[PDB]
Amino acid sequence: AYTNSFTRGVYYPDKVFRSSVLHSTQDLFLPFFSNVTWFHDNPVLPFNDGVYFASTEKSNIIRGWIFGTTLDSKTQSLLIVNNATNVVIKVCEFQFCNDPFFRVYSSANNCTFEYVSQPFLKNLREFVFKNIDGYFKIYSKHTPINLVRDLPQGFSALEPLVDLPIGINITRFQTLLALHGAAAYYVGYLQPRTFLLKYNENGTITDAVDCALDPLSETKCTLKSFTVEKGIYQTSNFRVQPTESIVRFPNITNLCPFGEVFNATRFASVYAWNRKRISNCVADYSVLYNSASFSTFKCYGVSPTKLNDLCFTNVYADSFVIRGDEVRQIAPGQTGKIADYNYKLPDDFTGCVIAWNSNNLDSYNYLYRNLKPFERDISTENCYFPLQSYGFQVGYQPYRVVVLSFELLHAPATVCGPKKSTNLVKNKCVNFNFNGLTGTGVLTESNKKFLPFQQFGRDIADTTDAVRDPQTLEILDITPCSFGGVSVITPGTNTSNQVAVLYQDVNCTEVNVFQTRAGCLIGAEHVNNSYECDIPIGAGICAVASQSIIAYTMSLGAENSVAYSNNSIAIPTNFTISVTTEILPVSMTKTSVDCTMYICGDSTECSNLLLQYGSFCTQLNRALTGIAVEQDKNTQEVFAQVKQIYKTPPIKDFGGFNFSQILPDPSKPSKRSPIEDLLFNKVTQKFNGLTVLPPLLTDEMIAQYTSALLAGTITSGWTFGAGPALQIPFPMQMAYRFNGIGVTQNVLYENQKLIANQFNSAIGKIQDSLSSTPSALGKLQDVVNQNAQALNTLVKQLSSNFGAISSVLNDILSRLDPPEAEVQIDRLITGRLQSLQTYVTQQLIRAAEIRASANLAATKMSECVLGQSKRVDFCGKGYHLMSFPQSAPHGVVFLHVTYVPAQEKNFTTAPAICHDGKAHFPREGVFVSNGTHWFVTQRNFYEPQIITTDNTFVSGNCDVVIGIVNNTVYDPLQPELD
Amino acid sequence: SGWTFGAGPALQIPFPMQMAYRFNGIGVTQNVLYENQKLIANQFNSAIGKIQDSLSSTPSALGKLQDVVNQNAQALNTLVKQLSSNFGAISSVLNDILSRLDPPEAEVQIDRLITGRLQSLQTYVTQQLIRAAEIRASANLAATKMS
Amino acid sequence: CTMYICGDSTECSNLLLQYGSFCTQLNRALTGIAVEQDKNTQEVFAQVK
Amino acid sequence: VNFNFNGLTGTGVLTESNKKFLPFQQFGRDIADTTDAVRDPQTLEILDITPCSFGGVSVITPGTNTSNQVAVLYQDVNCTEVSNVFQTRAGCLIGAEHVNNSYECDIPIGAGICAVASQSIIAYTMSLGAENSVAYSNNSIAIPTNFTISVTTEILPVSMTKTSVD
Amino acid sequence: ECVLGQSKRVDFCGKGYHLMSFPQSAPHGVVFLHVTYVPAQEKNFTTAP
Ligand SMILES: *[C@@H]1O[C@H](CO)[C@@H](O[C@@H]2O[C@H](CO)[C@@H](O)[C@H](O)[C@H]2NC(C)=O)[C@H](O)[C@H]1NC(C)=O
Ligand SMILES: *[C@@H]1O[C@H](CO)[C@@H](O)[C@H](O)[C@H]1NC(C)=O
Ligand SMILES: *[C@@H]1O[C@H](CO)[C@@H](O)[C@H](O)[C@H]1NC(C)=O
Ligand SMILES: *[C@@H]1O[C@H](CO)[C@@H](O)[C@H](O)[C@H]1NC(C)=O
Numbered sequence A: 001a002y003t004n005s006f007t008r009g010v011y012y013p014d015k016v017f018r019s020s021v022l023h024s025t026q027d028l029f030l031p032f033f034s035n036v037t038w039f040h041d042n043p044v045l046p047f048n049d050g051v052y053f054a055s056t057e058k059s060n061i062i063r064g065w066i067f068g069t070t071l072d073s074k075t076q077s078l079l080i081v082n083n084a085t086n087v088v089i090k091v092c093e094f095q096f097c098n099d100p101f102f103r104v105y106s107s108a109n110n111c112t113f114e115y116v117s118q119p120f121l122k123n124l125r126e127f128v129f130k131n132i133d134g135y136f137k138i139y140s141k142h143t144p145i146n147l148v149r150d151l152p153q154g155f156s157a158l159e160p161l162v163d164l165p166i167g168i169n170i171t172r173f174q175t176l177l178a179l180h181g182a183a184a185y186y187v188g189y190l191q192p193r194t195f196l197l198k199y200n201e202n203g204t205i206t207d208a209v210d211c212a213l214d215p216l217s218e219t220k221c222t223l224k225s226f227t228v229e230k231g232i233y234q235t236s237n238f239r240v241q242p243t244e245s246i247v248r249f250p251n252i253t254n255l256c257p258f259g260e261v262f263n264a265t266r267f268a269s270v271y272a273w274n275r276k277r278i279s280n281c282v283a284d285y286s287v288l289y290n291s292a293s294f295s296t297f298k299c300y301g302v303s304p305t306k307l308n309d310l311c312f313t314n315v316y317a318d319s320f321v322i323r324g325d326e327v328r329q330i331a332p333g334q335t336g337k338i339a340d341y342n343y344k345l346p347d348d349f350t351g352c353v354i355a356w357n358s359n360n361l362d363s364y365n366y367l368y369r370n371l372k373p374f375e376r377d378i379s380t381e382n383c384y385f386p387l388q389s390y391g392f393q394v395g396y397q398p399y400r401v402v403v404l405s406f407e408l409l410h411a412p413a414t415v416c417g418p419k420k421s422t423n424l425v426k427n428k429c430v431n432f433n434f435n436g437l438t439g440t441g442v443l444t445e446s447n448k449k450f451l452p453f454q455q456f457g458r459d460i461a462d463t464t465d466a467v468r469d470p471q472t473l474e475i476l477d478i479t480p481c482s483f484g485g486v487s488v489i490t491p492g493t494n495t496s497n498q499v500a501v502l503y504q505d506v507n508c509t510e511v512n513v514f515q516t517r518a519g520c521l522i523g524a525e526h527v528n529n530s531y532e533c534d535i536p537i538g539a540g541i542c543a544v545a546s547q548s549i550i551a552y553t554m555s556l557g558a559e560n561s562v563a564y565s566n567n568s569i570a571i572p573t574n575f576t577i578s579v580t581t582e583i584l585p586v587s588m589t590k591t592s593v594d595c596t597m598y599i600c601g602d603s604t605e606c607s608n609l610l611l612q613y614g615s616f617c618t619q620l621n622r623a624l625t626g627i628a629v630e631q632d633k634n635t636q637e638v639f640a641q642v643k644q645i646y647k648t649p650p651i652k653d654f655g656g657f658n659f660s661q662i663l664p665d666p667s668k669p670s671k672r673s674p675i676e677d678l679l680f681n682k683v684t685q686k687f688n689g690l691t692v693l694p695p696l697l698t699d700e701m702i703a704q705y706t707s708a709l710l711a712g713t714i715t716s717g718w719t720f721g722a723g724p725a726l727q728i729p730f731p732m733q734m735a736y737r738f739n740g741i742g743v744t745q746n747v748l749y750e751n752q753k754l755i756a757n758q759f760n761s762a763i764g765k766i767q768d769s770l771s772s773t774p775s776a777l778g779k780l781q782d783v784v785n786q787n788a789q790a791l792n793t794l795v796k797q798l799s800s801n802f803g804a805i806s807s808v809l810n811d812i813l814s815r816l817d818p819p820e821a822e823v824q825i826d827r828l829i830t831g832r833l834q835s836l837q838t839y840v841t842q843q844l845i846r847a848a849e850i851r852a853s854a855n856l857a858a859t860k861m862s863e864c865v866l867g868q869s870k871r872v873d874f875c876g877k878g879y880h881l882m883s884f885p886q887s888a889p890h891g892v893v894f895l896h897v898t899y900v901p902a903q904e905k906n907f908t909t910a911p912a913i914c915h916d917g918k919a920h921f922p923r924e925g926v927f928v929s930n931g932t933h934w935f936v937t938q939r940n941f942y943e944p945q946i947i948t949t950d951n952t953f954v955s956g957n958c959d960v961v962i963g964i965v966n967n968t969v970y971d972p973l974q975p976e977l978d
Numbered sequence B: 001s002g003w004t005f006g007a008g009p010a011l012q013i014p015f016p017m018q019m020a021y022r023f024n025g026i027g028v029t030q031n032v033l034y035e036n037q038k039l040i041a042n043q044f045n046s047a048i049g050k051i052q053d054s055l056s057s058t059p060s061a062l063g064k065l066q067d068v069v070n071q072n073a074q075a076l077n078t079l080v081k082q083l084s085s086n087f088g089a090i091s092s093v094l095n096d097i098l099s100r101l102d103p104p105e106a107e108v109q110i111d112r113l114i115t116g117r118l119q120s121l122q123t124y125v126t127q128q129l130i131r132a133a134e135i136r137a138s139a140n141l142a143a144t145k146m147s
Numbered sequence C: 001c002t003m004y005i006c007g008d009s010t011e012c013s014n015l016l017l018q019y020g021s022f023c024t025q026l027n028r029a030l031t032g033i034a035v036e037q038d039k040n041t042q043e044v045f046a047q048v049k
Numbered sequence D: 001v002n003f004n005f006n007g008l009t010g011t012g013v014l015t016e017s018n019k020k021f022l023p024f025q026q027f028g029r030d031i032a033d034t035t036d037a038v039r040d041p042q043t044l045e046i047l048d049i050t051p052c053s054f055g056g057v058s059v060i061t062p063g064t065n066t067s068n069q070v071a072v073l074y075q076d077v078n079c080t081e082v083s084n085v086f087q088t089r090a091g092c093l094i095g096a097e098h099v100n101n102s103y104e105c106d107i108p109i110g111a112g113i114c115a116v117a118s119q120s121i122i123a124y125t126m127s128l129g130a131e132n133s134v135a136y137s138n139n140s141i142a143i144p145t146n147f148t149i150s151v152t153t154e155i156l157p158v159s160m161t162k163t164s165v166d
Numbered sequence E: 001e002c003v004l005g006q007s008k009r010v011d012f013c014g015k016g017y018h019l020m021s022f023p024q025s026a027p028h029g030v031v032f033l034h035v036t037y038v039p040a041q042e043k044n045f046t047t048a049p
């Protein structure tokens, strides 16, 4: 029967010890959740590209084991029987028998070796058979298993107990036991695949994940982690593979006479050589390529093996002779008298040079003597004449030199290769070959017409979109095959595992489904509703809900539909003094990596070849120390706005306003506040060259500036940012900060207890929100993760070849022969210098971004804190009050206290007010009415007052303004008079 | 709603008084508007019409977004033309250097081509990062010219 | 990066892994700036609740 | 010690930290291709290769026009391995002497240590400024009776040289 | 905001309550003489809300 091979097949690939590293690799591997041919009769199963074999528990013993391709002498055989505390791994052509034991342990035909001292095997023998690079591999991991019906879960990684150099082919196998229904055993497959292997603290592969199986597994593969979160992740590109190769060479079928150049042995002397023109055939290059009846076959451009694939516009076979020496002068640019006067190949030469041996054909008549490439001039002028001959009959012996000059993609190709023509196909993704235009695409018809002289078209980026197919002369367009950016809409391994897949800009026809303007999105279904966007999917459609994956039309916060009218006014009768934390970075981890040590691991050889590059590392070090001093400058500019350091009063009688969360904690040994301690907890190596310069202001020193700023804000308020600090009681400062946003101070003192309770409840809610979700303090977490990712990719560049033979420098490199050592260390110096330069460029851009945010934080703590910003929506959503810096590492967490109205009402309002035939406009506030009585009140707090001359001023009359209504305005003097 | 819909929720305000307060907030007393409302509206609409006429015939009047779009198109076309660049590469610009070269020589020529194309793409990415820093400065300027 | 530098070819696709994670770094930078434009538009326009 | 463990070349301290090596595994590796752990031949012991105590070198000089005493710096290094020698978080600094008094930061070393002063080079704890403990009270106000019209001059580079390398 | 106007931004144009600034054509740059109102000679009194 067939059962689910859950997770077996994994094993230690790289043979080296490793710890806590997710070293992804690709080998011939068993995919997860594959079908197996379990037998309760030995099925001779094809060893496709490696197989995975396991026995069952069944108690007892699995006796003996029989393997091998066919046992029929077509290949050398293979056998891994187990008996008598020995393992015969002989490759002998054993007996072909369906009922063996030593029934089939015979016929000694062409064996290798044998291994002993390994009598291995309720158990489970895990085996892997693979033949890669000609070295057969065997793996073993025997583990007891009580269950026999259903294969147990769990990850078991195998070990290379032996690495056989069998040097054979293996194309099938089986397993036949001895004789005593019967026991069972499993058989699986492998495929070219890639996994992501998670090693433990003891270098034990405790986990492994595929990626070719599940799009969720694709996300686990790309992000190089076993965990994924909210977010669409670009994985790969969905490419439609070609069906079957098509070759359309022209209708010509004759064979060109290459014998009328190569078999032509009466070459023409280099003084006046002969060039033969050839065309209109499909003559083969196989006879010249395979039969190497020559001495030198140097090809520039084409190669001897690929010559049969291309069809050429025109071929000229230059023919001349030259001595055995100076043959290297037949090369682009190579100097010499023959090259200087007789024959000079062009610098951009393209062709094959065949200096086939003529010790018997060349040899008198073959005379020899700047000039243009492919020049030709034969003439004769204490005289001087270049008439020289050579009457030879091995060092000085002349030879025969024939040069083929090809020109490609300039005209209708006329001489082709031996490849047989194949029927043309249309409207299907098919890889093609038209006169050598190798490529893959779909062939459609276009209204464009090729000119009769024209052969094939092109686009920008030298893409041959249109080619008139030869042998039919038909208009065609090489549209690229259906390609679409495949993405993943996953809800995170923490919550679910169901996955949704996106196909970027493909009509649904070409592979539920839900069409978007960004493309058809499988794995999800539309929802005729509006929920806040979770995973932006694209083109206005975005997404698990109720244990189901959805993909709906993105909500935009619904339609509030505010009620406009000529007199529609909403004045808030209540407010919430809410604190909002918009977190900003100010600095990053200073690196200042030792470039001469990073790129060159203290190698004397590498240092010279690096200083040869001319102060590259000088600029690198200067830029890195400049941005490090820039981090120090940002920290000083944001935290050190004040010179004097203020100690908070021992008695905090701040009108009921707790700052114990934000003021320094006496119990904690440091000055970090309880909210600062929460920040520090919840936000929370030295390698070659890499280092971390500690900030000038330490964490306790940065916290000391932060505490000084908080103390100045709560005791001196905003005056300490201008000059000397001025003692301000906190209720007074909050009254001033109300007065600075168009709301009268009385709101504070008449709501002092209420605002204090709101502030403290808000700060408790800030602590709770920061303690529940990382999204609250995600800003510095993201920037620190960005810096750590940059450092990790920088140090992983060490493990990158960059074109070199080995990534590691100290041992394998700086150890080659000094010339080749210089060549390979130059490849490494270029690669690592490019990696470090792109790292420092990304770091300079990131430092510019952090510097913009640091100037933002400096302008906030100079305006939000050290004053009160009239810039609406700058210090938090709402009318701003004040702010609190918090010394979070590599950033600041501002507590942007803001005034936000909550409860509204409806009133009848008029732009003006008319009394006794005379206009009256409000000095401050807006005229509104509960209905029968008109009132003016602050724009952002319903505090109605009767209208008197104090709150109104007169300008104009009651016949010019539209929208005016009458009312009565009283006298601030008549009741005083009366 | 005026400005209140960004502080808290939307609080409806008739346009006359909203623009009266938008005078009051720049040192121009509100009494100007309540007497000049007709002329103010006429100048408003006439200036909108002037914008329309500048958009209909005057070129590069919207030359800033047009400029950034042209810059992006020029960068993309520069990448596309860099596809048609040699960087050496056996005097071949087609990536299909194979079907002409064996794996060793094809490898070295295509490695030169990858160095060239990777350098061009890295130049494009660096220029796009600097241009996106400029665009983000303008976007944080618009987000502070909004709100 | 795979299609730009290499396209349908696979041998240079293998060679591109040998040049470190430049493919991944560049693609991550492009995705970062794309999300950057998305959040620019959200901070400019979508700031309305 | 510079070492040649059965082919591998390097330089570092060969500790004896505990690790478990599988029989087929010879040595460990970090994220890069630098071998953190190598199993010693002839003993099968575990040795965690750790790089030497390297670090940058700074100079605390007060200016040739003022003095000539030099205080070379050794950062991110314990001075247990090579004037009065003083240690801090940023490193161990020689050529200077710690002082308990708080002085303003002239030459910042790192990790709060700042530095000629009285024919000697010092290395003190940075004085964040005068510890002005403002006497706050629930009914205390300060009012300035006077002012100072001071023209603070800040300089901004508006336009660099219009270099036009052709 | 500070040359042809007065900036209400605290600690933006000169350390103090900014008055105005005089540009000066410094080479390859500019220099602002940020005239500022910086108080001094404080005197402590008793306050009430
Ligand atoms: C590596 O193996 C050691 C073996 O000592 C693990 O430490 C634990 O050690 C105690 C005995 O002192 C055992 O009872 C435990 O079973 C061991 N725990 C585990 C998880 O094996 C050590 O934890 C292992 N490290 C890892 C996580 O790989
Ligand atoms: C092994 O192969 C050789 C090939 O020459 C053959 O002659 C021989 O009979 C084969 N079998 C034995 C007996 O090893
Ligand atoms: C060419 O010469 C070879 C030997 O030099 C000979 O075998 C062959 O018949 C000749 N014909 C052609 C087509 O080359
Ligand atoms: C997809 O194809 C269908 C018919 O083939 C066409 O009607 C439709 O317009 C195409 N998709 C879009 C987005 O237009």
Ligand SMILES: *[C@@H]1O[C@H](CO)[C@@H](O)[C@H](O)[C@H]1NC(C)=O
Residues within 6 Å of the ligand: A574, A575, A576, A754, A902
């Ligand atoms: C205003 O809202 C607060 C809570 O936000 C509430 O306690 C209070 O009762 C409301 N009304 C008044 C008049 O304060």
Ligand SMILES: *[C@@H]1O[C@H](CO)[C@@H](O)[C@H](O)[C@H]1NC(C)=O
Residues within 6 Å of the ligand: A652, A658, A660, A661
């Ligand atoms: C609020 O302040 C009082 C006295 O100032 C204090 O006892 C209490 O612990 C504070 N509240 C919190 C949550 O710390």
Ligand SMILES: *[C@@H]1O[C@H](CO)[C@@H](O)[C@H](O)[C@H]1NC(C)=O
Residues within 6 Å of the ligand: A563, A570, A904, A905, A906, B012
């Ligand atoms: C004001 O009146 C309109 C129309 O009845 C209503 O839709 C709205 O909810 C009311 N409230 C406010 C404060 O807008």
Ligand SMILES: *[C@@H]1O[C@H](CO)[C@@H](O)[C@H](O)[C@H]1NC(C)=O
Residues within 6 Å of the ligand: A930, A931, A932, A933
């Ligand atoms: C409007 O307000 C006044 C003063 O509060 C009150 O006397 C009157 O009853 C209110 N009228 C309405 C329409 O509720």
Ligand SMILES: *[C@@H]1O[C@H](CO)[C@@H](O)[C@H](O)[C@H]1NC(C)=O
Residues within 6 Å of the ligand: A914, A964, A965, A966
């Ligand atoms: C205000 O009263 C006058 C006469 O007292 C009247 O003519 C005028 O129309 C009134 N305003 C209105 C109705 O808006």
Ligand SMILES: *[C@@H]1O[C@H](CO)[C@@H](O)[C@H](O)[C@H]1NC(C)=O
Residues within 6 Å of the ligand: D078, D080, D088, D089
């Ligand atoms: C230097 O070594 C001593 C004792 O060997 C240790 O106490 C100290 O922590 C080390 N240096 C630092 C910076 O900790």
Ligand SMILES: *[C@@H]1O[C@H](CO)[C@@H](O)[C@H](O)[C@H]1NC(C)=O
Residues within 6 Å of the ligand: D135, E044, E045, E046
């Ligand atoms: C403030 O002034 C009062 C009255 O002169 C005086 O009693 C008090 O000591 C002064 N306090 C300070 C902080 O100097």
